[PDB]
Design a protein around this ligand. Structure first.
Ligand SMILES: [Cl-]
Lengths: 302, 302
């Protein structure tokens, strides 16, 4: 037995993190080849953030209004340009630590690692999920902005998230590395509703498989259910509906444990209806939804 | 609001991890200057592990029985030697990625990051605590051995743990980087009792401060207590006794929140006696003890 929330090793991302300063605002930037990527709101004053015209604000700014440090190395900004909500600062020097990378837009319920940074220096790494309502439940203090989320696939760093905003309701929102927000959010200090979150049903089932593999079996019961029966119970408890694609994705875990996916759904159903009766599963007293089936396979097979 | 279990960035440790093979056994090694450190049990056969004489087993082994890979780079073992339970393999080449480092022996209830590795390749990073019974509740699959725990202080990687054993009771045990086990454990496949674990009282109080700072206040009550009153309740619920040193260490968190340490103990007391009544604190339904006061300060101040 043994199963923890695991982040990807952060070394490949650490050598890409820089410090971006505009006026009283300093936050984080991502230096890949000759381009530093950061939130375009670095160019805003506390005042501007209320109702920014980023076209007109970006026109008033000059190269030299951007102060980009990497440890010591002051990097010289030789151009500035806007892609949706991300600022691209062109610099004189191509990062010699630039890993093999792609930019990807992930789906809701997928996980990624965040390298949490303050003034362009890495502080910590943690594992996150994209909530179904396209928010992130994270740790971002006041200069955490422009910190990035990522996955490592074979030899390639897949950058999927850049941190932009804390919402007045104390949740986080941000963009892909092309500057398109996840969810309905805008880079403006206004009231913005996240709307109803749900629990990532396929993740909870992945985690129940993780629990069986690590010896935790009390919640296995003598029932199956159909997808319809289950989804009627899911909808009552604000669980995401389960699709046949979800059942297909859980197949290997099914095969490893000899427990059919609908058998495990019948377990989940009872846990939703009667709670845990004061017991725990993998040392937790609530149902965990921030492990994907892929995360559980990786950790339960190396 | 926002508070997650955070590991240290792992980049400085990633460039030190190698693959060590002896016979059918391959595990992980830590390459600092011209020395690879791994568990001495790499030299054991499944059979030997039952009752190993490591002096006599190490004498039969030659340099060339040790196969040490770093990515590609086959490293040539030019000597082999034993310090308590750690094997030091001398190699021809000094790691050009050797960070500034120290070896430290941590106390029970302190935290550290583990870079979890399989065949000398980093898989993941997670935050751990040294349990009061000197075990680690972690994720170590069958080639996770020789993976290391560490802290980063200013510019210095402080290596504090090397993974050696899973105990038949499914918990983990290992050594400092001088090869002295934490706790009563030996590197022999026998039955070994961990003995009674307790909850790290000072950590739970640190985490209740974290909860107040991030807006979670339902459990604040109108009571104080003395250290004696509290420790009588602690001992019943297998909590570590709280000392004046513990109260001293929580001072800054006390000052930040305007809540006296004994006031928070009076909160903890009620939570131990009546449970949570089906509520949560920082999204958890049980009391968390794997954040130190130092971890909470770092995360609630950058
Ligand atoms: Cl919990």
């Amino acid at each position: 037995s043994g199963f923890r929330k695991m982040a990807f090793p952060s070394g490949k991302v650490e050598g890409c993190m820089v410090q971006v300063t505009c006026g009283t605002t300093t936050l984080n930037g991502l230096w890949l080849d000759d381009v530093v990527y950061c939130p375009r709101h670095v160019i805003c004053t506390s005042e501007d953030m209320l109702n920014p015209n980023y076209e007109d604000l970006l026109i008033r700014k000059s190269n030299h209004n951007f102060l980009v440090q990497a440890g010591n190395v002051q990097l010289r900004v030789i151009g500035h340009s806007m892609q949706n909500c991300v600022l691209k600062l062109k610099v004189e020097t191509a990062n010699p630590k630039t890993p093999k990378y792609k930019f990807v837009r992930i789906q809701p319920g997928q996980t990624f690692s965040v390298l949490a940074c303050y003034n362009g220096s890495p502080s910590g790494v943690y594992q996150c999920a994209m909530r179904p309502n396209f928010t992130v439940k994270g740790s971002f203090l006041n200069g955490s902005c422009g910190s990035v989320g990522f996955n490592i696939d074979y030899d390639c760093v897949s950058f999927c998230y850049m941190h932009h905003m804390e919402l007045p309701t104390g949740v986080y929102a941000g963009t892909d590395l092309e500057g398109n927000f996840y969810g309905p959010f805008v880079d403006r200090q206004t009231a913005q509703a996240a709307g109803t979150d749900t629990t990532i049903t396929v993740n909870v089932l992945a985690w129940l498989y993780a629990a069986v593999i690590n010896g935790d079996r009390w919640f296995l019961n003598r029932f199956t259910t159909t997808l319809n029966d289950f989804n009627l119970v899911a909808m009552k408890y604000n669980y995401e509906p389960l699709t046949q694609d979800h059942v297909d994705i859980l197949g290997p875990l099914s095969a490893q444990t000899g427990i059919a996916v609908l058998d495990m759904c019948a377990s989940l159903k009872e846990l939703l209806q009667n709670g845990m009766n004061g017991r725990t599963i993998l040392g937790s007293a609530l149902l965990e939804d921030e492990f994907t089936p892929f995360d559980v396979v990786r950790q339960c097979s190396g």
